[PDB]
Amino acid sequence: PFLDIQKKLGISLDRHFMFLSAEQPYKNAARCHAFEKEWIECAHGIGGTRAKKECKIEFDDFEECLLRYKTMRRMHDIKKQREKLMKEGKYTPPPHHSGREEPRP
Amino acid sequence: MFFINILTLLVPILIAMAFLTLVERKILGYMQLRKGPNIVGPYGILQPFADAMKLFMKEPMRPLTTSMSLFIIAPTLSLTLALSLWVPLPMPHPLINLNLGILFILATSSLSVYSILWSGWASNSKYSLFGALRAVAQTISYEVTMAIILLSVLLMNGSYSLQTLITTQEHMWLLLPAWPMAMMWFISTLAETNRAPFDLTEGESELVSGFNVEYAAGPFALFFMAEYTNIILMNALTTIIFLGPLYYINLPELYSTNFMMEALLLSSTFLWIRASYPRFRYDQLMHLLWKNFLPLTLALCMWHISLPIFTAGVPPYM
Amino acid sequence: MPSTFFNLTMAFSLSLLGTLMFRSHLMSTLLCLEGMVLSLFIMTSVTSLNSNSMSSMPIPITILVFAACEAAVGLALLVKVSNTYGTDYVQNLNLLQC
Amino acid sequence: AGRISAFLKNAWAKEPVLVVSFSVWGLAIIMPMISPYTKYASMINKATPYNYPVPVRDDGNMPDVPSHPQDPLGPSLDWLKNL
Amino acid sequence: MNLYTVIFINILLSLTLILVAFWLPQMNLYSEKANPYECGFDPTSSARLPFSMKFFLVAITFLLFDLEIALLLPLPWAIQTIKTSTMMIMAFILVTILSLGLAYEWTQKGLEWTE
Amino acid sequence: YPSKETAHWKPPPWNDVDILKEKAVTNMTLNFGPQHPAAHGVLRLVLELSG
Amino acid sequence: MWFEILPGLAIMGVCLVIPGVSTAYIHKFTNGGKEKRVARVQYQWYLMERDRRISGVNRYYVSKGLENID
Amino acid sequence: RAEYVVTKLDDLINWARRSSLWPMTFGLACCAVEMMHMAAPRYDMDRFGVVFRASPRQADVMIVAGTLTNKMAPALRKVYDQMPEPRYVVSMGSCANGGGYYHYSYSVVRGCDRIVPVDIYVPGCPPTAEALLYGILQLQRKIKREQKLKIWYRR
Amino acid sequence: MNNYIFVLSSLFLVGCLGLALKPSPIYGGLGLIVSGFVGCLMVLGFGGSFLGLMVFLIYLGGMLVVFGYTTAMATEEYPETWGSNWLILGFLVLGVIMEVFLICVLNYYDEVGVINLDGLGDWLMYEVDDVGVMLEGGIGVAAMYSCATWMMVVAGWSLFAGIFIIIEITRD
Ligand SMILES: COC1=C(OC)C(=O)C(C/C=C(\C)CC/C=C(\C)CC/C=C(\C)CC/C=C(/C)CC/C=C(/C)CC/C=C(\C)CC/C=C(\C)CC/C=C(\C)CC/C=C(/C)CCC=C(C)C)=C(C)C1=O
Ligand SMILES: CCCCCCCCCCCCCCCCCC(=O)OC[C@H](COP(=O)([O-])OCC[N+](C)(C)C)OC(=O)CCCCCCCCCCCCCCCCC
Ligand SMILES: CCCCCCCCCCCCCCCCCC(=O)OC[C@H](COP(=O)(O)OCCN)OC(=O)CCCCCCCCCCCCCCCCC
Ligand code: SF4
Known part of the structure; x- marks a missing residue:
């Protein structure tokens, strides 16, 4: 089964790199540190079925951060509408989006 | 301007290796109480050009029992890997600046070994097979030794770059801190370049020509160009790593001149070794490396792990 | 990144199909095994680089070490098979059915 | 011991590569444990500032941390300056 | 992009050289010319028979030592760590067990080219 | 329970070892012909080699 | 005699001096009298990109000093 | 004029092929002893640009130096055939020329020209290394006289 | 210059397809060398170069020993490259056509968004720290020396035990 000699002896052989929001080398992050932190802090203490039920908001936010399916679909919809308007001649892109922009530092 | 930079890197290297062939013939002759070529050119300087024209105007002579795809791929692969290996060297500013320059060097050298192996297997002949197997043994031994040597030396250095090697050797060479690593690295560069004493892949006496025994003129010239370019490159890498040329921010021309002088000296040292020594057996090369260099370099790698810790001389990251 | x-994943699937479908060569089966290994290495490295999981970056090195150990053991077993028969044929090693 | 000295001298005469390797291995083990500069490497790597030093709030109850970089408080690097 | 262009330029240079070598001279191909060499006699075998190398254990040991090399190579970034004592101990243990494996193989005559 | 599809089988040996000798190593025959530099111009040294 | 090898040695010498010197001069010519400004880390790359945006000619090597501030 | 350009190009290729002559590391007898005496530091063929190569694929001229035995003759013919196309033959010594001292032997090919087409015959038993170098330079002049591009252009 | 990683991934798929199609192990090692180089390029494009160069060097050594072994024992008189059977070539081009068909199907079915033709090259690198030092790959592999010493020791014991294992297997 699952022995717990690491919890019994108090050592941490492989427990500090179980997930993304856990002890990055110098001081770095893992691109979804806040979302994974919120999800784990939600799910701790009520784990299993209750964590699957009433931490669905935090899990959905974290999964959206990590996989970015909804952002991809939103950006694809925007670009598809833009290309349709370009074909229909009803849209001209601004100078900053298409071509020369004013650069700021 | 970048293509002009590519030309000014590539064309001088090819002329340098052709005159390396000339210098090798003349140095071997004068160590053999004779001359080199002195008839084709004013002082033999047209001899490599005559050799190149003759080789490229003879027929390539594709054989019957031969995997043609690998037979054609292997020499072009060898030449392009030699030039790609020449790419990231700083004198003192590289054409292409790589963070993991030494790792790039190691990968390209192993791929050159693959070029030799594919040529030997594709030219479906027994002597070619013998040369390919000898290449396998040789690259096993020198690959493990070279990896340990570079690990310890670049642990004395900072990152895996080469401008960092210039800044490390700004005040003093690396030969004085690590001279046993320099000796083992010189022997390993001989093994990498398949040069005398332990050539063993183009062994003219044990075999007929080794892996080139079925390669007629053309691709044979390509293999020769790759080998001699690798000779100049390994000597250049040795003088960048260990015999650090003088670097000044205001002018780099004296750095280039010092690098040229030391690279010429080490190339002439290679020709000197070829004139001096007989050939190893290819099991004796493996025994020599794995029983003398590998334990000593493991111990010296441990010593160079411990040295910056107990001297507090850990190099900077950049 | 998803493409x-x-x-x-399809490359791993192809190498798994190569491992499962034998063609007379134990060496080719080991080659398919190491193709699966390479696909897994590239998947893990790309995932860690995309998620910035520098703490989980030792995982590809670990799988490479253990994969080379298993490739070493497979080459040793292939050496023993060749010493037994001389041909290295998976259909030739079949005498344990009875 | 006579036998140990004779064995070591014979090994140094005949196989002076294993002797050097074992001696270098032992020297690399021993030397960090007796050097006075061993702590300095860890302290230098600690003092190297790869990250931004995030400031803390001033609750007025900490006198140890400085109020400005040009202050006598804080971990001064005079040991590294004079090292 | 720069390194890509240099790689492609070197590849195109090698291809141009071998294309010149193949389309420049005059070809006269017949069977005795393109037969395999074999020192002036017909080969007895087909040069594709099993070869039976004698350093197979050394080759497998080379695989294991190459992966030990891969383990040892991040040391230039490892020495920048804040702890450095566990780093030094771990590097010592790794090099020591690699050397112990080499010593055991040497004692058991693994790298001796058994014929 | 031998059938038509398994009537040709045999029981395993008691010590799990059976005779499977081939003796078909086929050592490579290579001739140091009368063109090899190692050969003294005129010699056809036929060599049975095991690698 | 032995000095007969010196023509080939000198040709090799000039052919080894040429690439590094040419690379340094071409770097100076392309970067406007300065060096290549290599970027080993993201901070250095960010500095280069910021300089390119600051210059206004989309060239990072056109350095802008105190003349931009009144 | 196309004739002038073709003549100069042909002179260039003849100069290349005559300045880079690679004989094969192939001899048979005392004449090959004199051949390596021509390789010796006195009459330096490497100074002339003439350097041995072991493989026939990298060879240009076969210096038939010795007695061509009947048992040897298929090997010599196979080795000559395995050369690439611009190949030459220098027979050296009386044995390779016309059998020599073993002309009436049951096992000796009476001249290597019965087996391979011979470009240059060098007389002697043995010819001196100076004489073999003379034959090599005469071969260089012979392939200097060749007009392949001009014959092609007027073809 | 946007679909560079996609072109590399397709080349990796082709190399793995050839390795699955199982040539003579000479060409199998060739295909695995090409696939290793391509995967190295993919890792380098996605980020740090240390992992890609490591897998390249490791597979170079591995396929070299593999080449030695398939010359020694895993060889035959006529080692088939790919054209000994027309079924192998027909199956390679069939797999290529199936790959094109499936990616066209997944581009047409853009609801999930796994593969998009218009959105290709837009989501390769998600978020990067623009200003920052010591954030490249290899720092974590160094952190194996200090933060994952358990990973380091299990890898080292695997190699040590593997030396003993291979000696005892090939003891004969
Ligand atoms: C008693 O019993 C007997 C024997 O037993 C002892 C015998 O033995 C025996 C047989 C006897 C013999 C066959 C006698 C033969 C003689 C010998 C064996 C002894 C002679 C000595 C040697 C063979 C050893 C030679 C040693 C040397 C050091 C010489 C060096 C030789 C080399 C091969 C290495 C140097 C390389 C070359 C010569 C060629 C290099 C040049 C190139 C390949 C050119 C390539 C360059 C390019 C392609 C560059 C192109 C690029 C550019 C950019 C150029 C630009 C061009 C433009 C046009 C612009 C007999 C019969 C016998 O009875
Ligand atoms: C790049 C810079 C220049 C480098 C040198 C270049 C010029 C010199 C070139 C010479 C010719 C080389 C041609 C190839 C030669 C190949 C043969 C060869 O070298 O074999 C290797 C030979 C092998 O010798 P061997 O094989 O004869 O040994 C016999 C061994 N048995 C019996 C088992 C076969 O030597 C070595 O392996 C030595 C390697 C270098 C050792 C350096 C040790 C330095 C001292 C360390 C510390 C000592 C103190 C200890 C601690 C004290 C503390 C207070
Ligand atoms: C005859 C066929 C030959 C086929 C084999 C060709 C071999 C080529 C030479 C050996 C290559 C070995 C592997 C090298 C990989 C690149 C090494 C490297 O570190 O690249 C990373 C580098 C930038 O990284 P870094 O240094 O960190 O810079 C960041 C800030 N400066 O740079 C980059 O990111 C650039 C990434 C691309 C570099 C490689 C380009 C290769 C192009 C394909 C070549 C083959 C094409 C197929 C065959 C064509 C027809 C024959
Ligand atoms: S011609 Fe005279 S010297 Fe030459 S091989 Fe015959 S017997 Fe010997």
Whole structure:
């Protein structure tokens, strides 16, 4: 089964790199540190079925951060509408989006 | 301007290796109480050009029992890997600046070994097979030794770059801190370049020509160009790593001149070794490396792990 | 990134099909095994680089070490098979059915 | 011991590569444990500032941390300056 | 992009050289010319028979030592760590067990080219 | 329970070892012909080699 | 005699001096009298990109000093 | 004029092929002893640009130096055939020329020209290394006289 | 210059397809060398170069020993490259056509968004720290020396035990 000699002896052989929001080398992050932190802090203490039920908001936010399916679909919809308007001649892109922009530092 | 930079890197290297062939013939002759070529050119300087024209105007002579795809791929692969290996060297500013320059060097050298192996297997002949197997043994031994040597030396250095090697050797060479690593690295560069004493892949006496025994003129010239370019490159890498040329921010021309002088000296040292020594057996090369260099370099790698810790001389990251 | 990950998963699937479908060569089976290994290495490295999981970056090195250990053991077993028969044929090693 | 000295001298005469390797291995083990500069490497790597030093709030109850970089408080690097 | 262009330029240079080598001279191909060499006699075998190398254990040991090399190579970034004592101990243990494996193989005559 | 599809089988040996000798190593025959530099111009040294 | 090898040695010498010197001069010519400004880390790359945006000619090597501030 | 350009190009290729002559590391007898005496530091063929190569694929001229035995003749013919196309033959010594001292032997090919087409015959038993170098330079002049591009252009 | 990683991934798929199609192990090692180089390029494009160069060097050594072994024992008189059977070539081009068909199907079915033709090259690198030092790959592999010493020791014991294992297997 699952022995717990690491919890019994108090050592941490492989427990500090179980997930993304856990002890990055110098001081770095893992691109979804806040979302994974919120999800784990939600799910701790009520784990299993209750964590699957009433931490669905935090899990959905974290999964959206990590996989970015909804952002991809939103950006694809925007670009598809833009290309349709370009074909229909009803849209001209601004100078900053298409071509020369004013650069700021 | 970048293509002009590519030309000014590539064309001088090819002329340098052709005159390396000339210098090798003349140095071997004068160590053999004779001359080199002195008839084709004013002082033999047209001899490599005559050799190149003759080789490229003879027929390539594709054989019957031969995997043609690998037979054609292997020499072009060898030449392009030699030039790609020449790419990231700083004198003192590289054409292409790589963070993991030494790792790039190691990968390209192993791929050159693959070029030799594919040529030997594709030219479906027994002597070619013998040369390919000898290449396998040789690259096993020198690959493990070279990896340990570079690990310890670049642990004395900072990152895996080469401008960092210039800044490390700004005040003093690396030969004085690590001279046993320099000796083992010189022997390993001989093994990498398949040069005398332990050539063993183009062994003219044990075999007929080794892996080139079925390669007629053309691709044979390509293999020769790759080998001699690798000779100049390994000597250049040795003088960048260990015999650090003088670097000044205001002018780099004296750095280039010092690098040229030391690279010429080490190339002439290679020709000197070829004139001096007989050939190893290819099991004796493996025994020599794995029983003398590998334990000593493991111990010296441990010593160079411990040295910056107990001297507090850990190099900077950049 | 999702297109590349789909391609890497399909590459692993192809190497698994190569492992499962034998063609007379234990060496070719070991080659398919190491193709699966390479696909998994590339998948893990791309995932860690995309998620910035520098703490989980030792995982590809670990799988490479253990994969080379298993490739070493497979080459040793292939050496023993060749010493037994001389041909290295998976259909030739079949005498344990009875 | 006579036998140990004779064995070591014979090994140094005949196989002076294993002797050097074992001696270098032992020297690399021993030297960090007796050097006075061993702590300095860890302290230098600690003092190297790869990250931004995030400032803290001033609750007025900490006198140890400085109020400005040009202050006598804080971990001064005079040991590294004079090292 | 720069390194890509240099790689492609070197590849195109090698291809141009071998294309010149193949389309420049005059070809006269017949069977005795393109037969395999074999020192002036017909080969007895087909040069594709099993070869039976004698350093197979050394080759497998080379695989294991190459992966030990891969383990040892991040040391230039490892020495920048804040702890450095566990780093030094771990590097010592790794090099020591690699050397112990080499010593055991040497004692058991693994790298001796058994014929 | 031998059938038509398994009537040709045999029981395993008691010590799990059976005779499977081939003796078909086929050592490579290579001739140091009368063109090899190692050969003294005129010699056809036929060599049975095991690698 | 032995000095007969010196023509080939000198040709090799000039052919080894040429690439590094040419690379340094071409770097100076392309970067406007300065060096290549290599970027080993993201901070250095960010500095280069910021300089390119600051210059206004989309060239990072056109350095802008105190003349931009009144 | 196309004739002038073709003549100069042909002179260039003849100069290349005559300045880079690679004989094969192939001899048979005392004449090959004199051949390596021509390789010796006195009459330096490497100074002339003439350097041995072991493989026939990298060879240009076969210096038939010795007695061509009947048992040897298929090997010599196979080795000559395995050369690439611009190949030459220098027979050296009386044995390779016309059998020599073993002309009436049951096992000796009476001249290597019965087996391979011979470009240059060098007389002697043995010819001196100076004489073999003379034959090599005469071969260089012979392939200097060749007009392949001009014959092609007027073809 | 946007679909560079996709072109590399397709080349990796082709190399793995050839390795699955199982040539003579000479060409199998060739295909695995090409696939290793391509995967190295993919890792380098996605980020740090240390992992890609490591897998390249490791597979170079591995396929070299593999080449030695398939010359020694895993060889035959006529080692088939790919054209000994027309079924192998027909199956390779069939797999290529199936790959094109499936990616066209997944581009047409853009609801999930796994593969998009218009959105290709737009989501390769998600978020990067623009200003920052010591954030490249290899720092974590160094952190194996200090933060994952358990990973380091299990890898080292695997190699040590593997030396003993291979000696005892090939003891004969
Ligand atoms: C008693 O019993 C007997 C024997 O037993 C002892 C015998 O033995 C025996 C047989 C006897 C013999 C066959 C006698 C033969 C003689 C010998 C064996 C002894 C002579 C000595 C040697 C063979 C050893 C030679 C040693 C040397 C050091 C010489 C060096 C030789 C080399 C091969 C290495 C140097 C390389 C070359 C010569 C060629 C290099 C040049 C190139 C390949 C050119 C390539 C360059 C390019 C392609 C560059 C192109 C690029 C550019 C950019 C150029 C630009 C061009 C433009 C046009 C612009 C007999 C019969 C016998 O009875
Ligand atoms: C790049 C810079 C220049 C480098 C040198 C270049 C010029 C010199 C070139 C010479 C010719 C080389 C041609 C190839 C030669 C190949 C043969 C060869 O070298 O074999 C290797 C030979 C092998 O010798 P061997 O094989 O004869 O040994 C016999 C061994 N048995 C019996 C088992 C076969 O030597 C070595 O392996 C030595 C390697 C270098 C050792 C350096 C040790 C330095 C001292 C360390 C510390 C000592 C103190 C200890 C601690 C004290 C503390 C207070
Ligand atoms: C005859 C066929 C030959 C086929 C084999 C060709 C071999 C080529 C030479 C050996 C290559 C070995 C592997 C090298 C990989 C690149 C090494 C490297 O570190 O690249 C990373 C580098 C930038 O990284 P870094 O240094 O960190 O810079 C960041 C800030 N400066 O740079 C980059 O990111 C650039 C990434 C691309 C570099 C490689 C380009 C290769 C192009 C394909 C070549 C083959 C094409 C197929 C065959 C064509 C027809 C024959
Ligand atoms: S011609 Fe005279 S010297 Fe030459 S091989 Fe015959 S017997 Fe010997």
